[PDB]
Structure formats: C-alpha cells, structure tokens
Amino acid sequence: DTHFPICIFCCGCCHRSKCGMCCKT
Numbered sequence: 001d002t003h004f005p006i007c008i009f010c011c012g013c014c015h016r017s018k019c020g021m022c023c024k025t
Contacts (some may be wrong), residue, residue, distance in 0.1 A: 001025070 001024045011019035 005023045005025075007021040007023040009019075010022040
C-alpha cells in the first residue's frame with residue numbers, strides 16, 4: 001500500500017507460489 005515502504009524481498013512460499021517484494025504488509 002505504501003508508495004515507498006521497505007519492500008523487503010519475500011518469496012511466496014505457501015500463499016502465492018511466487019517470489020515478490022513485501023512492499024505492503
């Protein structure tokens with residue numbers, strides 16, 4: 001949601017089986 005948050009990298013292990021930056025929360 002944040003325009004420029006932390007965007008810490010986080011691979012979708014279980015929910016979404018896809019890697020993606022955890023910008024929101």
